Design a protein around this nucleic acid. Sequence first.
RNA 1: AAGCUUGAGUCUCGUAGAGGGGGGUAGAAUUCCAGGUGUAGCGGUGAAAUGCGUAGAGAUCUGGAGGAAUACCGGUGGCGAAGGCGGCCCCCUGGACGAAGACUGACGCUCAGGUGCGAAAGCGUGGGGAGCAAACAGGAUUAGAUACCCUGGUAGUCCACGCCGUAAACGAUGUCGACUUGGAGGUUGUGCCCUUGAGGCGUGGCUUCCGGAGCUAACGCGUUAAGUCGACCGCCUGGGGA
RNA 2: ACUAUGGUUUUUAUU
Lengths: 55, 51, 271, 129, 88, 100
Amino acid sequence: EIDYKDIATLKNYITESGKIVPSRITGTRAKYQRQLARAIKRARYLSLLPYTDRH
Amino acid sequence: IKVRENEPFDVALRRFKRSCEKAGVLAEVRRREFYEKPTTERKRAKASAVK
Amino acid sequence: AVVKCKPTSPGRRHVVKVVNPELHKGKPFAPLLEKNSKSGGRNNNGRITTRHIGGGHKQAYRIVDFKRNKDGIPAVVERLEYDPNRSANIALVLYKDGERRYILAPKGLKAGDQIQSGVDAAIKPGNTLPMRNIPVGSTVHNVEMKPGKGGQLARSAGTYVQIVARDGAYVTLRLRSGEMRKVEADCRATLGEVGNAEHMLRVLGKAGAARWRGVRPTVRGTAMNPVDHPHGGGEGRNFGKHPVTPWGVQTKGKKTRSNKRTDKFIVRRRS
Amino acid sequence: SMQDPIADMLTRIRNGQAANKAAVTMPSSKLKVAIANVLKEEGFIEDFKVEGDTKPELELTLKYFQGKAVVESIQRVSRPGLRIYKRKDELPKVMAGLGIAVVSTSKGVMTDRAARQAGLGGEIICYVA
Amino acid sequence: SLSTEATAKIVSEFGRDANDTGSTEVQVALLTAQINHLQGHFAEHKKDHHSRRGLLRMVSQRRKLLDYLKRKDVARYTQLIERLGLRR
Amino acid sequence: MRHYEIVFMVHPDQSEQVPGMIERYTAAITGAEGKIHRLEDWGRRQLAYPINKLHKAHYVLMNVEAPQEVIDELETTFRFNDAVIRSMVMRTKHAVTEAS
RNA sequence: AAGCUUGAGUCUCGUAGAGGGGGGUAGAAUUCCAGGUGUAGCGGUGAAAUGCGUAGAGAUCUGGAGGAAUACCGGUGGCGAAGGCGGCCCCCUGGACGAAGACUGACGCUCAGGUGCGAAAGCGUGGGGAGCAAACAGGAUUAGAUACCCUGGUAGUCCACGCCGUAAACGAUGUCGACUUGGAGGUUGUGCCCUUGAGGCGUGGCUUCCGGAGCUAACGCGUUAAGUCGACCGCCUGGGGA
RNA sequence: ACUAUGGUUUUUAUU
């Protein structure tokens, strides 16, 4: 929430393939699933997360 | 899910077709709750005393 | 940008004109002019060497800088102007410590715009620097083959070339002709594209409006006597002959390069 | 939306009969109450109540018999966009003497029986038997 | 929407009593402030669809109230064209 | 005034030209009654991918309150500096307190 | 007409949203371009040929441009006069809707004419052209191939401005509003409750299935009805000609 | 691999 300059907790909601984890395995409320899913994408533009996942 | 450990060889065998992804673990026969149990086991063990 | 003319007079319906609010329209800067003497397209013994050039009307020269005058020194654009002998037109620049000069226009529609020179230049369009300084993928115009009074390659309106590799004293680049060339890197090139790019949108509407600017219509070969042009037609205007020049040689697909010497710069020629 | 004060009254007296519902509610108006009094006087309903002040609500107690509803014939035989009017001598007969027509007279809501008793005509608003 | 102050500059200044909106001209004046603010939506930009279509919707809404003012408000149209520049 | 985060990356071969821009625009914000709540160095990080022959970069975190037209005039100031790789302007979330 | 404030709309604080406009910007790969390493294959179908290459391709390094689009997020979860709309960041903004008060006083709803608008394709005058591709030029298949299949490829698809205005525009049901049946599921606000709840009880706002009255020639509709009713507007009288 | 077809037409009333 409000921050994407740290990712060490945010990575908990990402798969090993770099895609967003479905809320039904984390019990996360859908409003917060939406926020975390867009926050994971915001953190790619600060180069803290890759876009690929090609090797 | 993808390959993360091998290291000089892997189990392979129909890699992720009816193994490690969809039936078992969700879909078709809906058995053994492997999707919704592993966090409940990690919630309750824990040590829970004297290591 | 260009606009279409109204039918306020005969034939004018088809005319298109170029308009630029930043263009000066007044006279060129008087200390930077000469008359540019012409030899009329004939040698000292009165014989034709260049054709279709007779019937000219007065043109000057803006003392245009191709010699890379004041190298490594910054300047600023003061005004934009017209030049009858180059399709990109011209710009007037004022140099760091004094004086003006006219330069071949880099792409742009404004004045008050600064430029830099040499290896202290920024990687920005309009700046002029040795090709040994520019990175792979860069676009350039007026790129230079040798230092001197003149300047070579990519000068016609809207043209540029792009560099693909660099190794030692040379750089490899891709031409508008489809040629691939390996050129000397110490030579002074200008970043980006050469200006105007709208020169082939010109109409030359009135038949007298080509003549009043010194342009001559070329004389049709089939309309001549067969013993004065080998392409000359019969009384019934009949063709019946392969195309040729006024000097009897065939033109449709027939090659003419005969050099076998300029090998150093060759990689792969046009196709 | 709501053009006439009784277009939602007749349907709510006709419907609910198969489930034998002993009551029905609707929004209340001067004409709905003036009709509810004559429907009690002619034995078609057993009670009517008004409840409210600025937008009142009307509850009707519906009438039943052994395994059956009692109001088995109820129609308007007129429409708010194309109304029906009759002279004092021309008020409509229903089931050749076994039914009654309801008239809105210059002295209020009454049966054609009572309008002819007084020597009045008016607007025809319901047919019941 | 219009600001609380640009609203107050009509509904607490233009009516016949303190905070009066029962003068029909105040319903025309508040819309004449909202339509001028919608003609203020532009710069930056010119070709916004929902503002060009919504501007014409505020013209429809002003033709509604101005026709009514010259129909059921007796004389108050000539007592309003001295206070609104409807002919610029 | 409006609140913004502003978190920027410095190019490792242009890096000496950043202080002549940012430590000089702090006057242009405070002259407009604006505030800069930290301007702290976040250090040299290894990147999650190579940005075309750039794989390790230095980060800075600003935190600002200003007029919107002073942050628009800061965007052209970051773009004319060219030693900075994205300003990363992001709206609202209120001002930082107690050093985050 | 003047008061009332039950129809309808609005402000303060608040809710969710791929609704619209104007500016910026990014990761990969197909492609194109130049040099290494090292060779004759690649490409493609039911099975093949035309072709790219052998004058140095495919593959793999090395070093960079060029173009269209935006993985996951994503849920019968949401929005929009209609058509339709999912990158991420900034600058503008309509509708719907929740709590508690204040306000206009019929301001609603319907609508001939008129003026409004696009999913694709096309036109004008120029730009830009990876992935694909009317027509075009080949090859194979064949009795022939204008079709399957395949190498290349123009207009087009992209962009600026002015035109074009259509459809199975079909969520085939013109519209505002009220009443009512058996059982579940999803989903956004606000009240009430020591949440004694590892969530209900009310009340607004939203919404998918499965039964059933009534309704149909039959499929279907089914409280978000094609059921029960009332007002405004619009349309209709056999096939083919056409 | 690997396909094109064939005009027109019929059979009781009666308790």
